[PDB]
Amino acid sequence: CHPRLSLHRPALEDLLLGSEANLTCTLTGLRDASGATFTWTPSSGKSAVQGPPERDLCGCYSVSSVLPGCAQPWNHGETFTCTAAHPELKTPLTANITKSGNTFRPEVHLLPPPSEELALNELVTLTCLARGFSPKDVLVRWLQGSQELPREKYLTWASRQEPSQGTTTYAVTSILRVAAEDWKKGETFSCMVGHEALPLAFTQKTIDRLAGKPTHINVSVVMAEADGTCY
C-alpha cells in the first residue's frame, strides 16, 4: 500500500477535568512492523511507549507511540515534532502539532419543555444548545439539584459546522428526559458545557419551572416623594 504519518491532539475530557495531556503519533501501512522510529523534540521523561502493532484496512500492521506530559506546556504554546525515520523507507517524513489559535467561545442555551408535553403527565424533554465555537471539541454534562446524573441517561449528538456567516464556527446539541411530576414539584436541572476557549474553562445554565415564561404579570409602580434610599 502507501505509508502515511499522523499526529493527533490530546482529548478534551482528560485535559479539562484532569491535566494529563498525553500525545500520540501513528504510522500505518507497514508489514514488517518491528523496524520503526519515533522522535519528539522535547523528551525529558523520554520513556515514550510503543504498543502492539494492531491491524488496519485488510490486515496491514500499524505502529504508534505515546509521549506522556501534562497541560502547562500545551496551553502555553509549545510545539511537538514527531518524526519517522524507519528503515522500511530510505527517506524520513515529519509532522507537527500545536494548540489552535483564532478561537471563539460558545453560547450556551437551555430550553424549557414544550407546552404539549405537559398535558400527558408522563415524561418531559429538556434541550441544550451550544453554538459558535471555533475548535471542534466540547464537553456536555447534566446535573439534577447538585447531583451529577450518570452518562447513560441522556443522548448527545456530534459537533458539526454551521452555515458560514464569514468565519467557520460549530454547534452541538443534547437532550434529557425526566419525570413529569418532579418537574412540577420544583426540582432544578442544569446543563454544563466545557470548552478550551472559555476563561474559567466552564460555564453553566440552570433552569426550573418558576423561572419561566409567565401567564399572569402584575406590575405596581410606586412614587416616593419621601426618600431615595430603598430599604
Binding site: 474559567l200 466552564f202 453553566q204 419561566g212 406590575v219
Partner: protein
C-alpha cells in the same frame, strides 16, 4: 408572591413568582410574576450634588436584572470545578437610581480657613457613615 428571583438595590426593583394551583381545571395551573418599582422623585442623575437636574426618565431591562455573573462551585466527578453562570457579563459601571442603606456616599468640598483652602469631606447619607 412566594419566591424571590431578583432583589436589586441599585435600581430598587424586586421580582417574585408563584405557581398558583388554580381551582377550575384542576390539572392545569398558572404562573404568576410580580414586579415592584419604587421611583424616587428627588434624586439626581449622577450621585453628586450639582450634576444635572433631577432624573425624570427611568429605564429597566429585565435581561440585566436577572443577570448572574459571580463564579460558582460545581462537583462534577469527584472534584470541585469553578464555572461562570452567564453569557453576557463583559464589563462599577452601572448607574444607580436610589441609594442603599448599607453603603456610604461622600463628597469633597473646598472651604477657606483664613489662609489657604482645604479638601473637606462631607457625608451625603449620615446614618451609614460612622467609622465602626
Amino acid at each position: 408572591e412566594r419566591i424571590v428571583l431578583v432583589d436589586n438595590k441599585c435600581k430598587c426593583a424586586r421580582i417574585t413568582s408563584r405557581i398558583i394551583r388554580s381551582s377550575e381545571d384542576p390539572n392545569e395551573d398558572i404562573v404568576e410574576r410580580n414586579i415592584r418599582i419604587i421611583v424616587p422623585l428627588n434624586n439626581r442623575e449622577n450621585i453628586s450634588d450639582p450634576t444635572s437636574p433631577l432624573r425624570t426618565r427611568f429605564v429597566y431591562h429585565l435581561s440585566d436584572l436577572c443577570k448572574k455573573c459571580d463564579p460558582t462551585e460545581v462537583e462534577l466527578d469527584n472534584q470541585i470545578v469553578t464555572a461562570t453562570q452567564s453569557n453576557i457579563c463583559d464589563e462599577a459601571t452601572e448607574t444607580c437610581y436610589t441609594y442603599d442603606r448599607n453603603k456610604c456616599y461622600t463628597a469633597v468640598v473646598p472651604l477657606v480657613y483664613g489662609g489657604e483652602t482645604k479638601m473637606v469631606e462631607t457625608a451625603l447619607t449620615p446614618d451609614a457613615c460612622y467609622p465602626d
